[PDB]
Design a protein around this ligand. Structure first.
Ligand code: NAD
Ligand code: NAD
Lengths: 297, 297
């Protein structure tokens, strides 16, 4: 079948595209290359440079399933204007749903986020916890989920919403690990750290997403939201230490809408698919620093 | 203080404006006159014809509180294109929140809807029930609430979201009562009916909204969602009968994303404000038919 992956030139999307291609699917990538890169696109995939903010972004594009992963990256949320978060998340997602409805797409796998929970009352956070986002980005992802669930109920466009915790690995060009490497690249002797969160290596995240999608296609529920992340967490200061050692540096650490604590409960995912993380958060962070060192140092 | 009422030239908005004016507030109406009418605007209010779909709709407009009541009317939801529901509800509401944030508005009273609940599992429906909208309009109102609650938590723009059941009274130009009158006007001998819902006379709805707003301004919770509607309900066929009698007609009834059953639990509203409806649903429908008969027959 034909699978459309929006944001397929980006970090998670490009790895997801690689796995779908390895599994034999005909993959179509749609990406505006705002944060993604043509170098990350699998040679076997068909790239279409379109902007999802345009209602007509999908003219001529057909697929049976769409993995809607396009969005501005979840980083430095307070420094981007709210209208950018709104347009790149809510308007883009609505436009994807209208294209899905009008072209008869059967399934939307939406890349959601732990940010829809905001500063959760319960941690590890189960899927039942309410939307209490504290960033415009978080509100935008929650609104996207509400719209997806409604299109599933009303138009039969089924949706699996994957709420990701932090995902890390090769090709990453945003986030705390990338930031620390770039800071040490600027000055290897000092590292400025301005939090405890769960990190999943991208290989694990893609496996979990695809295993969940497979099970979802075997279910008949119109909509399902599922957390995808690791079972543990690491503190920002530990990330800082791991990155330094990978680089063989001994920097002087200097402390100088963002959710402070996050860890999603992944009991539903594990129960539904048998999936298990293959690396701890600390291990996912170390491998990623090693991956990025070769790409950025 | 200065109060801005978007959609103040419309049905609920014009009556809300009348009461705010009667209470002494300086009222500014912003409305694009798409479904509202200049004839409904209180002479004491200041009218600005602007379109909330424009990010800059509020240039030059200042207020301490905004009653955001503008939206396309909640009617014949399945016959309007989804993008219209999306733009008139989600984009407009986001633009109102950005203007509120940038101009330092302290409170947003958002006109939400029973449709955010979809076909509720529990009826009368308490505020705790989840968003399960089945219409794009319902999804749009729920997304609007999520964005409002986030702006309250993040930017301090407090929000009272009023989830209305059906509101009826003078100036109404949409909905089942209006439709039946216009149908009988076309042919007084036959009435085609294509449901059980709660109806509140507009005077009651405006009183409840303002009493809730007063209490909300005395609270410190950033966000509060409150149901506003009657305690009982009437069936479509009863509405049909009431309208006929008001008109002195004896028509032959002929049965030929829309929520089928709705009644909101108003325990929280009554507890918080002491408010009580002054007319039953059947009485609100009869008075409205009498009001509309003079305006339309
Ligand atoms: N990486 C994480 O830890 C993480 C965490 C939570 C959620 N997510 C979600 O996963 C998805 C991918 O994130 P990512 O980390 O890979 O970020 P990314 O920036 O690398 O990938 C996003 C891709 O979408 C593309 N894109 C953005 N706007 C577009 C538009 N208007 N039209 C077309 N393409 C557009 C970008 O160019 C980019 O290639 C996003 O939806 C994001 O919210 C990621
Ligand atoms: N009447 C009901 O029973 C009911 C039920 C549930 C919710 N509501 C809500 O109450 C509010 C008012 O509804 P109503 O019944 O009075 O409908 P209405 O159509 O009479 O009033 C809506 C007003 O908003 C204005 N408007 C629409 N789009 C606009 C835009 N883009 N820019 C500026 N102005 C715009 C319209 O011209 C109109 O005057 C809405 O938000 C609606 O969802 C009403």
């Amino acid at each position: 079948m034909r699978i459309v992956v929006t944001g397929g030139a980006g970090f998670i999307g490009s790895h997801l595209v690689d796995k779908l291609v390895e599994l034999g699917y005909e993959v179509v990538v749609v990406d505006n290359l705002s944060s993604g890169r043509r170098e990350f696109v699998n040679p076997s995939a068909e790239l279409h440079v379109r902007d999802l903010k345009d209602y007509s972004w999908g003219a001529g594009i057909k697929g049976d399933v769409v993995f809607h992963f396009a969005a501005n990256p979840e980083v430095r949320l307070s420094t981007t204007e709210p209208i950018v978060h709104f347009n790149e998340n809510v308007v883009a997602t609505f436009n994807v749903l209208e294209w899905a409805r009008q072209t008869g797409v059967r399934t939307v796998v939406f890349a959601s986020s732990s940010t829809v929970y905001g500063d959760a009352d319960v941690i590890p956070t189960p899927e039942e916890e309410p939307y209490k986002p504290i960033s415009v980005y978080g509100a935008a992802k929650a609104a996207g989920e509400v719209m997806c669930a409604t299109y599933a109920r009303l138009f039969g466009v089924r949706c699996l919403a994957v709420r990701y915790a932090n995902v890390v690995g090769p090709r990453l060009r945003h986030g705390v690990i990338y930031d620390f490497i770039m800071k040490l690249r600027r000055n290897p002797n000092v590292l400025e750290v301005l939090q405890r969160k769960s990190y999943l290596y991208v290989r694990d995240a893609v496996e979990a997403t695809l295993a969940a999608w497979k099970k979802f296609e075997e279910m008949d529920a119109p909509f399902l939201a599922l957390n995808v992340g690791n079972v543990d967490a690491v503190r920002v200061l530990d990330i800082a230490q791991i990155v330094a050692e990978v680089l063989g540096l001994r920097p002087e650490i200097r402390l100088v809408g963002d959710v402070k604590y996050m860890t999603l409960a992944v009991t539903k995912l594990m129960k539904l698919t048998g999936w298990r993380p293959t690396m701890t958060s600390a291990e996912a962070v170390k491998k990623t620093a090693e991956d990025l060192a070769k790409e950025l140092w």
